[PDB]
Design an enzyme around this catalytic site. Structure first.
Site, PDB file in Angstrom:
ATOM      1  N   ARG A 121      66.084  77.516  40.989  1.00 36.69           N
ATOM      2  CA  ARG A 121      64.881  78.309  41.012  1.00 36.69           C
ATOM      3  C   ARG A 121      63.850  77.737  40.053  1.00 36.69           C
ATOM      4  O   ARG A 121      64.162  77.458  38.899  1.00 36.69           O
ATOM      5  CB  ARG A 121      65.217  79.749  40.653  1.00 36.69           C
ATOM      6  CG  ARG A 121      65.965  80.459  41.749  1.00 36.69           C
ATOM      7  CD  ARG A 121      66.344  81.865  41.377  1.00 36.69           C
ATOM      8  NE  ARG A 121      67.200  81.882  40.198  1.00 36.69           N
ATOM      9  CZ  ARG A 121      67.888  82.946  39.797  1.00 36.69           C
ATOM     10  NH1 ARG A 121      67.819  84.074  40.491  1.00 36.69           N
ATOM     11  NH2 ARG A 121      68.644  82.879  38.707  1.00 36.69           N
TER      12      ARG A 121
ATOM     13  N   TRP B 288      58.650  87.098  31.157  1.00 42.02           N
ATOM     14  CA  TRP B 288      59.791  87.745  30.518  1.00 42.02           C
ATOM     15  C   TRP B 288      59.678  87.698  29.000  1.00 42.02           C
ATOM     16  O   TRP B 288      59.938  88.679  28.308  1.00 42.02           O
ATOM     17  CB  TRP B 288      61.091  87.075  30.955  1.00 42.02           C
ATOM     18  CG  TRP B 288      62.171  88.026  31.257  1.00 42.02           C
ATOM     19  CD1 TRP B 288      63.078  88.555  30.379  1.00 42.02           C
ATOM     20  CD2 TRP B 288      62.490  88.570  32.540  1.00 42.02           C
ATOM     21  NE1 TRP B 288      63.942  89.406  31.040  1.00 42.02           N
ATOM     22  CE2 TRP B 288      63.603  89.430  32.367  1.00 42.02           C
ATOM     23  CE3 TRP B 288      61.937  88.427  33.818  1.00 42.02           C
ATOM     24  CZ2 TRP B 288      64.167  90.140  33.425  1.00 42.02           C
ATOM     25  CZ3 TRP B 288      62.510  89.122  34.875  1.00 42.02           C
ATOM     26  CH2 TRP B 288      63.612  89.974  34.668  1.00 42.02           C
TER      27      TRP B 288
ATOM     28  N   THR C 249      77.329  87.445  31.330  1.00 44.20           N
ATOM     29  CA  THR C 249      76.606  86.696  32.368  1.00 44.20           C
ATOM     30  C   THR C 249      75.182  87.234  32.663  1.00 44.20           C
ATOM     31  O   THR C 249      74.396  86.565  33.349  1.00 44.20           O
ATOM     32  CB  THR C 249      77.394  86.639  33.702  1.00 44.20           C
ATOM     33  OG1 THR C 249      77.606  87.961  34.206  1.00 44.20           O
ATOM     34  CG2 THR C 249      78.749  85.923  33.515  1.00 44.20           C
ATOM     35  N   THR C 250      74.843  88.412  32.137  1.00 42.55           N
ATOM     36  CA  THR C 250      73.453  88.889  32.192  1.00 42.55           C
ATOM     37  C   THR C 250      72.554  87.963  31.387  1.00 42.55           C
ATOM     38  O   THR C 250      71.353  87.930  31.600  1.00 42.55           O
ATOM     39  CB  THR C 250      73.276  90.340  31.640  1.00 42.55           C
ATOM     40  OG1 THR C 250      73.547  90.375  30.228  1.00 42.55           O
ATOM     41  CG2 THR C 250      74.183  91.323  32.368  1.00 42.55           C
ATOM     42  N   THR C 251      73.173  87.206  30.482  1.00 39.79           N
ATOM     43  CA  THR C 251      72.513  86.357  29.490  1.00 39.79           C
ATOM     44  C   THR C 251      71.865  87.202  28.405  1.00 39.79           C
ATOM     45  O   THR C 251      71.215  86.664  27.513  1.00 39.79           O
ATOM     46  CB  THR C 251      71.431  85.416  30.107  1.00 39.79           C
ATOM     47  OG1 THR C 251      70.311  86.196  30.540  1.00 39.79           O
ATOM     48  CG2 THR C 251      71.985  84.630  31.286  1.00 39.79           C
TER      49      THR C 251
ATOM     50  N   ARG D 251      72.947  94.436  33.797  1.00 39.09           N
ATOM     51  CA  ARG D 251      74.073  94.244  34.708  1.00 39.09           C
ATOM     52  C   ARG D 251      74.035  95.185  35.916  1.00 39.09           C
ATOM     53  O   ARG D 251      74.102  94.722  37.060  1.00 39.09           O
ATOM     54  CB  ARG D 251      75.393  94.432  33.977  1.00 39.09           C
ATOM     55  CG  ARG D 251      76.576  94.301  34.899  1.00 39.09           C
ATOM     56  CD  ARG D 251      76.934  92.848  35.139  1.00 39.09           C
ATOM     57  NE  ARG D 251      76.134  92.252  36.196  1.00 39.09           N
ATOM     58  CZ  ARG D 251      75.644  91.019  36.164  1.00 39.09           C
ATOM     59  NH1 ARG D 251      75.864  90.228  35.122  1.00 39.09           N
ATOM     60  NH2 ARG D 251      74.929  90.583  37.184  1.00 39.09           N
TER      61      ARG D 251
ATOM     62  N   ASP E  21      70.954  94.523  38.213  1.00 39.77           N
ATOM     63  CA  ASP E  21      71.145  93.280  38.955  1.00 39.77           C
ATOM     64  C   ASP E  21      72.143  93.439  40.102  1.00 39.77           C
ATOM     65  O   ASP E  21      71.885  92.979  41.209  1.00 39.77           O
ATOM     66  CB  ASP E  21      71.599  92.158  38.030  1.00 39.77           C
ATOM     67  CG  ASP E  21      71.597  90.805  38.717  1.00 39.77           C
ATOM     68  OD1 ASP E  21      70.825  90.623  39.685  1.00 39.77           O
ATOM     69  OD2 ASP E  21      72.363  89.920  38.290  1.00 39.77           O
TER      70      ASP E  21
ATOM     71  N   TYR F  46      62.843  94.888  38.762  1.00 41.72           N
ATOM     72  CA  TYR F  46      63.736  95.281  39.835  1.00 41.72           C
ATOM     73  C   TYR F  46      63.364  96.638  40.384  1.00 41.72           C
ATOM     74  O   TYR F  46      64.146  97.253  41.109  1.00 41.72           O
ATOM     75  CB  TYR F  46      65.182  95.272  39.350  1.00 41.72           C
ATOM     76  CG  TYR F  46      65.727  93.885  39.134  1.00 41.72           C
ATOM     77  CD1 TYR F  46      65.433  93.176  37.977  1.00 41.72           C
ATOM     78  CD2 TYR F  46      66.532  93.274  40.090  1.00 41.72           C
ATOM     79  CE1 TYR F  46      65.917  91.883  37.783  1.00 41.72           C
ATOM     80  CE2 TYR F  46      67.025  91.988  39.901  1.00 41.72           C
ATOM     81  CZ  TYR F  46      66.711  91.298  38.747  1.00 41.72           C
ATOM     82  OH  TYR F  46      67.191  90.025  38.554  1.00 41.72           O
TER      83      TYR F  46
ATOM     84  N   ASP G 266      65.227  91.937  43.756  1.00 36.29           N
ATOM     85  CA  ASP G 266      65.268  90.836  42.801  1.00 36.29           C
ATOM     86  C   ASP G 266      63.863  90.234  42.630  1.00 36.29           C
ATOM     87  O   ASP G 266      63.501  89.262  43.293  1.00 36.29           O
ATOM     88  CB  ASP G 266      66.270  89.775  43.279  1.00 36.29           C
ATOM     89  CG  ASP G 266      66.592  88.729  42.215  1.00 36.29           C
ATOM     90  OD1 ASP G 266      65.956  88.720  41.136  1.00 36.29           O
ATOM     91  OD2 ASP G 266      67.489  87.898  42.476  1.00 36.29           O
TER      92      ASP G 266
ATOM     93  N   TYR H 263      62.698  88.543  40.277  1.00 37.79           N
ATOM     94  CA  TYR H 263      62.677  87.236  39.638  1.00 37.79           C
ATOM     95  C   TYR H 263      62.865  86.151  40.675  1.00 37.79           C
ATOM     96  O   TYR H 263      62.203  85.114  40.638  1.00 37.79           O
ATOM     97  CB  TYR H 263      63.755  87.137  38.570  1.00 37.79           C
ATOM     98  CG  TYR H 263      63.880  85.772  37.943  1.00 37.79           C
ATOM     99  CD1 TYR H 263      63.046  85.387  36.902  1.00 37.79           C
ATOM    100  CD2 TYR H 263      64.845  84.866  38.386  1.00 37.79           C
ATOM    101  CE1 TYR H 263      63.169  84.133  36.321  1.00 37.79           C
ATOM    102  CE2 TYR H 263      64.973  83.616  37.813  1.00 37.79           C
ATOM    103  CZ  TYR H 263      64.134  83.254  36.780  1.00 37.79           C
ATOM    104  OH  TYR H 263      64.260  82.011  36.209  1.00 37.79           O
TER     105      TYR H 263
HETATM  106  C1  LIG Z   1      67.821  85.519  36.799  1.00 45.11           C
HETATM  107  C2  LIG Z   1      69.181  85.231  36.103  1.00 45.11           C
HETATM  108  C3  LIG Z   1      70.243  85.930  36.622  1.00 45.11           C
HETATM  109  C4  LIG Z   1      70.016  86.836  37.830  1.00 45.11           C
HETATM  110  O1  LIG Z   1      70.168  86.161  39.036  1.00 45.11           O
HETATM  111  P1  LIG Z   1      71.554  86.500  39.794  1.00 45.11           P
HETATM  112  O2  LIG Z   1      71.425  87.877  40.389  1.00 45.11           O
HETATM  113  O3  LIG Z   1      71.798  85.482  40.916  1.00 45.11           O
HETATM  114  O4  LIG Z   1      72.644  86.428  38.619  1.00 45.11           O
HETATM  115  P2  LIG Z   1      74.232  86.748  38.519  1.00 45.11           P
HETATM  116  O5  LIG Z   1      75.068  85.601  38.949  1.00 45.11           O
HETATM  117  O6  LIG Z   1      74.581  88.092  39.299  1.00 45.11           O
HETATM  118  O7  LIG Z   1      74.654  86.837  37.054  1.00 45.11           O
HETATM  119  C5  LIG Z   1      69.242  84.722  34.646  1.00 45.11           C
HETATM  120  C6  LIG Z   1      68.115  83.717  34.268  1.00 45.11           C
HETATM  121  C7  LIG Z   1      66.822  84.399  33.793  1.00 45.11           C
HETATM  122  C8  LIG Z   1      66.791  85.158  32.624  1.00 45.11           C
HETATM  123  C9  LIG Z   1      67.582  84.583  31.445  1.00 45.11           C
HETATM  124  C10 LIG Z   1      66.006  86.520  32.458  1.00 45.11           C
HETATM  125  N1  LIG Z   1      65.976  87.295  33.679  1.00 45.11           N
HETATM  126  C11 LIG Z   1      67.187  87.977  34.177  1.00 45.11           C
HETATM  127  C12 LIG Z   1      67.132  88.706  35.339  1.00 45.11           C
HETATM  128  C13 LIG Z   1      68.298  89.297  35.835  1.00 45.11           C
HETATM  129  C14 LIG Z   1      69.538  89.081  35.217  1.00 45.11           C
HETATM  130  C15 LIG Z   1      69.586  88.363  34.056  1.00 45.11           C
HETATM  131  C16 LIG Z   1      68.421  87.852  33.499  1.00 45.11           C
HETATM  132 MG   LIG Z   2      72.488  83.779  39.922  1.00 47.97          MG
HETATM  133 MG   LIG Z   3      74.288  89.866  41.178  1.00 47.75          MG
END
Ligand SMILES: C/C(=C\COP(=O)(O)OP(=O)(O)O)CC/C=C(\C)CNc1ccccc1
Ligand SMILES: [Mg+2]
Ligand SMILES: [Mg+2]
Ligand SMILES: [Mg+2]
Length: 536
Positions: A252, A261, A389-391, A429, A432, A508, A513, A515
């Protein structure tokens, strides 16, 4: 080794942010007026003998106008006096506002202030249903509940149904202010986003507006926006000289959204270095996430995970060529930070963010292993991995790097996973997983969050997405409780964590999503904060 097809939308911005030159002529003009306007506003705040309701409306207005950060002292002194006096002799509007303002600033004012508006049941007196301003403030206040405020359990529902019923017949701009509150409450919104809306769509259109405050707010917002644009230009250049757009096309391309952000975490000028540091990290971890999530083989993600753990350039040769691109960039970024912080001797603190990134990466790899094996963990086990994994543990920690005032004791606190940190991590979490449930129940991912909740509890996708939104509500109560004095660390280090929770709610909104698909939601925000100026 053939890989999943790239399916992401390209950055919709091109290089329209790549080069911004500040107009010093304009900027010094704006700044010179603002100094005068600031003092005019300070004296408004320090005026002797105001009524309680006038004081609360003044402070409310300044905060919504985005200029309150100029008066943290003054505003606090005033609320502290209000709090320590206990005034239980007002109407719904003044009471609800008093409640909200004090709670937002950590003053644990009792929810008993609302008892006079309720029957012997804790159900709000229906006779109040014709008091729109009272309802409006009760609505906003209902979002700062902690676990101890069960007295307010009815407030959201009560205020909502009657605000909805009144809205179409309200005069403007009150109608628009109500409609927007119903869609986005103040407390859980992104501050710059709400401020832009308040200044332009509401305050600028009030019959009663204070002209000095309006002007002040317009100039300040446009002035900071010049700073933000510089910041984004600098970061855009940095991202372009990385060229992941071509070398890592599977990922992405969202550095503008990443800046959005970081802007949401803090907007004040004093946090400029912190924003620039933060957004780089956000951007980079987004790449790592896409590499696990949409490109790299399990064998490949193993070498990647181990190399991150060992953290040492000698490991690049062990990695596939495209993974050397992201890996050296990661190691480079942290040596950058170490140097950027080198002058203030705060270089050491970088290892806190480093350790948190290692942790994120570890759980990316676990997550990957579950998907390959088709494992559907119990919800407890799933969360113990999926929280990191949310970071968000990681971004929170990063957000402190650029704050001059952040001591080691602050990182020490943040490392012990304090309850406020964990709550916004939880909110990220569960939101998402709710949004991207049908995104990735199509992409073959039997290991989704919601899919665990269903197989575990024996409940449908309905009850699953609920019980999750359930935990989000709990988490907001914990965030709100976490702001209350005595605070474990200075409030300056709590607001980024609260802001992190806000941004997730906003991106969200309506369960999408924003982002990955910035089109519908994020692009209007980005335009109003970083493209269009407030016309004066
Ligand atoms: C945007 C991303 C994760 C979300 O995408 P996905 O839904 O595919 O993740 P997942 O594998 O379920 O953990 C992390 C990179 C961007 C950051 C740091 C800030 N924004 C963010 C948005 C949603 C979740 C976590 C962080
Ligand atoms: Mg992802
Ligand atoms: Mg997910
Ligand atoms: Mg992932």
């Amino acid at each position: 080794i053939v890989r999943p097809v790239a399916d992401f939308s390209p950055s919709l911005w091109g290089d329209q942010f790549l080069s911004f030159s500040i107009k010093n002529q304009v900027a010094e003009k704006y700044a010179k007026e603002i100094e005068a306007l600031k003092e005019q506003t300070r004296n408004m705040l320090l005026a002797t003998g105001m009524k309680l309701a006038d004081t609360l409306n003044l402070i409310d207005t300044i905060e919504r106008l985005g200029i309150s950060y100029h008066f943290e002292k003054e505003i606090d002194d005033i609320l502290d006096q209000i709090y320590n006096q206990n005034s239980n002799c007002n109407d719904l509007c003044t009471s609800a506002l008093q409640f909200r303002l004090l709670r937002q600033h950590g003053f644990n004012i009792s929810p008993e202030i609302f008892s006079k508006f309720q029957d012997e049941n804790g159900k709000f007196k229906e006779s109040l249903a014709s008091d729109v301003l009272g309802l409006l403030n009760l609505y906003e206040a209902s979002h700062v509940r902690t676990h101890a405020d069960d007295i307010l359990e009815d407030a959201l529902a009560f205020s909502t149904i009657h605000l909805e019923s009144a809205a179409p017949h309200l005069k403007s701009p009150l109608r628009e202010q109500v409609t927007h509150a119903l869609e986005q409450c103040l407390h859980k919104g992104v501050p710059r986003v709400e401020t832009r809306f308040f200044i332009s769509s509401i305050y600028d259109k009030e019959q009663s507006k204070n002209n000095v405050l309006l002007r002040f707010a317009k100039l300040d917002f446009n002035l900071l926006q010049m700073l933000h644009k510089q910041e984004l230009a600098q970061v855009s250049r940095w991202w372009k000289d990385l060229d992941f757009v071509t070398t890592l096309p599977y990922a992405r391309d969202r550095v503008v959204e990443c800046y959005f952000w970081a802007l949401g975490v803090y907007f004040e000028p004093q946090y400029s270095q912190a924003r620039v540091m933060l957004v780089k990290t956000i951007s980079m971890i987004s790449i790592v996430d896409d590499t696990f999530d949409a490109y790299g083989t399990v064998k490949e993600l193993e070498a990647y995970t181990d190399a991150i753990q060992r953290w040492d350039i000698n490991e690049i040769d062990r990695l596939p060529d495209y993974m050397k691109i992201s890996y050296k960039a990661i190691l480079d970024l942290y040596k950058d930070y170490e140097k950027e912080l080198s002058s203030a001797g705060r270089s050491h603190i970088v290892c806190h963010a480093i350790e948190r990134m290692k942790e994120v990466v570890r759980n990316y790899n676990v997550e990957s292993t579950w998907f390959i094996e088709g494992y559907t963990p119990p919800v407890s086990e799933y969360l113990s991995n999926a929280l990191a994994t949310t970071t968000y543990y990681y971004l929170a920690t990063t957000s402190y790097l650029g704050m001059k005032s952040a001591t080691e004791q602050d990182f020490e606190w943040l490392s012990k996973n304090p309850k406020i940190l964990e709550a916004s991590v939880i909110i990220c979490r569960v939101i998402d997983d709710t949004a991207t449930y049908e995104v990735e129940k199509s992409r073959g991912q039997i290991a989704t969050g919601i899919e665990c909740c269903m197989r575990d509890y024996g409940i449908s996708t309905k009850e699953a997405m609920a019980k999750f939104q359930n935990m989000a509500e709990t988490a907001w109560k914990d965030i709100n409780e976490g702001l209350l004095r005595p605070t474990p660390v200075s409030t300056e280090f709590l607001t980024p964590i609260l802001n992190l929770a806000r941004i997730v709610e906003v991106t969200y909104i309506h369960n999408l999503d924003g982002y990955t698909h910035p089109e519908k939601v994020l692009k209007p925000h980005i335009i109003n904060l970083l493209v269009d100026s407030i016309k004066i």
